[PDB]
Design a protein around this nucleic acid. Structure first.
Lengths: 91, 103, 60, 44, 77
RNA sequence: UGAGAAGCAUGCUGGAGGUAUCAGAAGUGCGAAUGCUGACGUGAGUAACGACAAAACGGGUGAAAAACCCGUUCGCCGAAAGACCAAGGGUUCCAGUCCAACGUUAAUCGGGGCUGGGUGAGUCGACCCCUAAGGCGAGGCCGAAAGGCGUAGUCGAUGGGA
RNA sequence: GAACCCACUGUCGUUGAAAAGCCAGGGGAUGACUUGUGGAUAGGGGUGAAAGGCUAAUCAAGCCUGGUGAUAGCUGGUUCU
RNA sequence: CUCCGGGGAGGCGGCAAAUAUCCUUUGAUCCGGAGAUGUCUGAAUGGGGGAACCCACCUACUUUAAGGUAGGUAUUGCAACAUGAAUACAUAGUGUUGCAAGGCGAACGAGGGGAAGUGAAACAUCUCAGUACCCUUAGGAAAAGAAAUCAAUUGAGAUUCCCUCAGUAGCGGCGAGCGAACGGGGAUCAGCCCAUUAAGUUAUGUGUGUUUUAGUGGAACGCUCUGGGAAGUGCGAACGUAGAGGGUGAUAUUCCCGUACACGAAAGGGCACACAUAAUGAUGACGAGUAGGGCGAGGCACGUGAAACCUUGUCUGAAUAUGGGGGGACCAUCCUCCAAGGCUAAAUACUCCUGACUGACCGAUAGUGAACCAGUACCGUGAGGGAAAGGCGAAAAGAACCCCU
């Protein structure tokens, strides 16, 4: 795989109550990822760019909301979230 | 012809006609001169930035055509022209032809 | 930076491209974490990557 | 009481769909008229 | 299509005119039929869709010349 | 002021255009066409506030409580007024905050406004393999043109396949 | 005789809860039965156990656009002195 | 994003104003020219498909796990090559390579098909009308074009368009209606070829002129009065190859942008002409299923009428310069021309677009449906139908603070 795509697979971490509880109690990291990323791609990117070993990856897609600002109607973009479970105690 | 940011000018039109000052900024066709065209602005308090609201005095922009370059020698309103001296294009006074004062 | 990049060879340009892409990812991580105060760095990195790509295409 | 419109997406797109319009000469003319008039939505 | 290969004749449009001068649209069609002709140069039968005028032209000029002319025109036979 | 269509002067309002005379050209005078567009009357504070079971009291919050929250009683459905799937809808889902508009009354409440959050698959479904009705269809047959039918084939679940 | 499919009588409603309904009775209910999904038939045409019935709340010839500003010896209207 | 040229104090696009970072005289923003990158659908072309989706194969470099990268894989037509039935040579068929086409878009051209309302005070001949509409296809224009043509004082000389001739001569249920030509005056002006191969056209390359894609300089007003504000009053002054237009707190040749004028191009593009090659004209060498005729239709202003002339669906069918076509039934004389093979510019038709300029055209119920986030909201299964909505103030200086709630 190309490092160019490796460096773009991961967008940013997720901060929320569910993510905090999961990280604290099970060592699961929640990431915002590219809409077109695969589980294997995310696994490889996490291992390469964080020096940790991944056991399993779970993914889900949430559709963007339709908002009304003034008289204009718009839609936000879809988001993909990855749950990555690490081995034993890591990170 | 151009009135530059740091020039000294004299107001020829409006309620401030007959007063001189230093330009602070030029944008579009509006220029602000230090200590001229003041307004009383009523400012509402802002929670995030504090700075309890109060009455504040600040300069209001004037149309560019209402001010003119001030000539040091005669202390009189004048007009600006362009002349190529040596290898540099330079501003001059149309009244005397001397190069515009640099400040 | 364009003049400095021009003198470099293809190998050096490609190595710097990889380094800058890694730096861009790290800057994104930092901004997501919210620990970075200055934001012009991301734009600098993106434009540097574009410049390196243009120079590589020109040379090759 | 049952009314005229009983929706079904598969039938709707199989009858009035983009490829259905492209499949025939008259449908292509319908698309041309809608493009000339400037419709934001050409087909269902 | 009802097109003669030798002469290019095709159905044309005209009028039925009645005794009271009522007019109606009509078509005049050619006397078109399929015919097999022997060709010695190629040692085979060639099937052509043509008219009786085309048959007269073939009788006048010979099968070889007409076939050559059609091939030159672009017909595949 | 004049016989009329109308003219003239001036108080108030308004804040930047107007135009004599003589010629010239017209989208040149509205009460009606069950005329067209918008605004507003009368009926009149009149009719009505939409199944099948019904409500009562104490406390809480609040500017305001018959309708919200907690509690004690009463009544109603219980082969549908319960639980679920496909189709269809698309955020209506959860939490915080607000009551101008909506909710056939009020509203602290809401499927209403604003901010955030939420869907996790080798075993569930789709995709995928296979075909029915039928669609399209290289060549091919036919037809003024457009085109029609159809072979090999290729699609097509409402069915078969861990 | 229930579910399911129908619509024979009467009351109510007729600016309705409803542009065809409710309530009390009524008929079929293993069959020429009922029903889901997906297909075929297109306007002088289709389909019809046949009422000129149905063909998107429209049918003795659907709807939309064009000929088109059709024609009307008919009715109405036609503005200052 | 890169490079070239312009320019010199600001700038980080708008609804939509703000703070914050920020970039800039080692030259930013911005303007002109040339390059780099350019996801998916859509003729869509690797197969499929409910457009923006699903699935697959081959080659080459990397790779160690189940990947990446760069390409290629549609159909039809033509050409070369290879392979190859019934069938013995063959032929059909099959395959590889190379080239070309498909689609979209305003009007104008050309061609294939082709109505009805209406008028005739009914209506069928006729009219509407070769109009509306469907289909095929080219160019910057198309088409036509150089006499087997007109004329008749025995003359004129290829096509195309305008004014006359003339509402004339004629056609017509001789109704309603339709409606020429000869001759004259203008616009433009041009002829050249059939296999010893012409004019003309197209693509590439070179040179001489010309015009465009940013830009630079550019004259000359003071006092006084009313006023919130002067460009308005009164007094005098200056420039003018410049007193066009717009703006500035009310009406400005001398306040700003400009105006006449002068000047300007690194790079790229258009046009005229000269020259060097490619193709083209061009499967064509004097015109036989031809001209003419019988039958049924269509077109010519002309409805079969005394119907001359052109096209042909069908049946026939010559002479060939000692020859043949036309001059309005037809015969003789006379006059005129040479069909059955081609190419060709200008005058002519139009505007989706580009730059400049104009209006006894409209000024928010007007003018485009649309001055405003409009072919949107909204209605309908769908083709389709289709609105309303401009104005604070010169400058936000857009009301600090107090009171009722």
């Amino acid at each position: 795989m190309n490092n160019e795509r490796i460096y773009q697979v991961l967008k940013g971490p997720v901060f929320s109550e569910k993510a905090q509880v999961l990280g604290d109690t099970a060592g699961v990291q929640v990431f915002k990822v590219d809409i077109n990323a695969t589980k294997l791609e995310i696994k490889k990117a996490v291992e390469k760019l964080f020096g940790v070993e991944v056991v399993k990856v779970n993914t889900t897609i949430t559709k963007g909301k339709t908002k009304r600002f003034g008289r204009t109607l718009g839609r936000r973009s879809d988001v993909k979230k990855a749950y990555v479970t690490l081995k034993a105690g890591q990170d | 012809a151009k009135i530059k940011k740091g020039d000294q000018v004299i107001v020829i039109a409006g309620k401030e006609k007959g007063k001189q000052g230093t330009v602070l900024s030029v944008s579009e066709d509006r220029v602000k001169v230090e200590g001229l065209n003041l307004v009383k602005k009523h400012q509402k308090p802002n929670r995030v930035t504090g700075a309890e609201g109060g009455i504040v005095t600040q300069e209001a922009s004037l149309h560019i055509s209402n001010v003119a370059i001030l000539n040091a020698t005669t202390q009189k309103a004048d007009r600006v022209g362009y002349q190529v001296i040596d290898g540099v294009k330079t501003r001059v006074y149309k009244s005397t032809g001397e190069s515009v004062a640099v400040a | 930076k364009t003049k400095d990049l021009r003198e470099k060879s293809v190998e050096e340009l490609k190595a710097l491209l990889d380094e800058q892409q890694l730096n861009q990812f790290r800057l994104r991580m930092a901004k997501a974490t919210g620990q970075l105060g200055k934001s012009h760095e991301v734009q600098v990195a993106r434009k540097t990557i574009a410049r390196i790509k243009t120079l590589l295409t020109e040379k090759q | 009481m049952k009314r005229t419109f009983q929706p079904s997406e598969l039938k709707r797109k199989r009858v009035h769909g983009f490829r259905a319009r492209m499949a025939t000469k008259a449908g292509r003319q319908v698309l041309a008229r809608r493009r000339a008039k400037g419709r934001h939505s050409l087909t269902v | 299509s009802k097109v003669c290969q030798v002469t290019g004749k095709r159905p044309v449009v005209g009028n039925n005119v009645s005794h009271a001068n009522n007019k109606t649209k009509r078509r005049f069609e050619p006397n078109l039929h399929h015919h097999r002709f022997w060709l010695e140069s190629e040692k085979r039968f060639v099937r052509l869709r043509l008219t009786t005028k085309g048959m007269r032209i073939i009788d006048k000029l010979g099968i070889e010349k007409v076939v050559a002319d059609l091939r030159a025109q672009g017909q595949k036979i």
